[PDB]
Amino acid sequence: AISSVLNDIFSRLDPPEAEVQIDRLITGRLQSLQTYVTQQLIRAAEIRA
Amino acid sequence: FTNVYADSFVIRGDEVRQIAPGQTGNIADYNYKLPDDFTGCVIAWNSN
Amino acid sequence: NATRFASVYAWNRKRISNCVADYSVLYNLAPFFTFKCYGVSPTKLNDLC
């Protein structure tokens, strides 16, 4: 996306133009959580071993 | 589909391109708007 | 509204700054033939600075 701030997308663009750019920013923040929580399951398995 | 609401009027040739969702004009702002989820077709014909 | 303008190869670039803009001839009224915006929302012209 052009800017990572969600106030700089939806208030600077059309509502058909925002929902393409907002859904790229949510899915990039979902993949940052899917790298985080999967890493916390692997590294706690070495603690419990 | 269920039923249809036919909106029939006479509009000038400068404003005739703005029947669409998300447009800006004299007739588009202050008279006739369309939402983004609106579904239908636009049929135009020359009445001159 | 000026009487004489310039050409397409050499135009007149006017720098307009430090004032309060009136968008009512470009948004509320339409005397003008076409309004084409690309990266800017046309309703949000009076919002962003």
UniProtKB/Swiss-Prot annotation, chain C:
Effect of changing T34A: reported as: In strain: Omicron/BA.2, Omicron/BA.2.12.1, Omicron/BA.4, Omicron/BA.5, Omicron/BQ.1.1, Omicron/XBB.1.5, Omicron/EG.5.1
Residues carrying a glycan: N1
**How the protein is affected by changing L26I?**
In strain: Omicron/XBB.1.5, Omicron/EG.5.1
Which domain of life does the protein's organism represent? Answer: Viruses
* Quaternary organization: Binds to host ACE2. RBD also interacts with the N-linked glycan on 'Asn-90' of ACE2. Cleavage of S generates a polybasic C-terminal sequence on S1 that binds to host Neuropilin-1 (NRP1) and Neuropilin-2 (NRP2) receptors. Interacts with host integrin alpha-5/beta-1 (ITGA5:ITGB1) and with ACE2 in complex with integrin alpha-5/beta-1 (ITGA5:ITGB1). May interact via cytoplasmic c-terminus with M protein. May interact (via N-terminus) with host bilirubin and biliverdin, thereby preventing antibody binding to the SARS-CoV-2 spike NTD via an allosteric mechanism.
The free-text function statement in the UniProt record for this protein reads: Attaches the virion to the cell membrane by interacting with host receptor, initiating the infection. The major receptor is host ACE2. When S2/S2' has been cleaved, binding to the receptor triggers direct fusion at the cell membrane. When S2/S2' has not been cleaved, binding to the receptor results in internalization of the virus by endocytosis using host TFRC and GRM2 and leading to fusion of the virion membrane with the host endosomal membrane. Alternatively, may use NRP1/NRP2 and integrin as entry receptors.
User: Which protein is depicted?
Assistant: Spike protein S1
Which species is this UniProt entry from?
Answer: Severe acute respiratory syndrome coronavirus 2 (2019-nCoV)
This protein's encoding gene: S
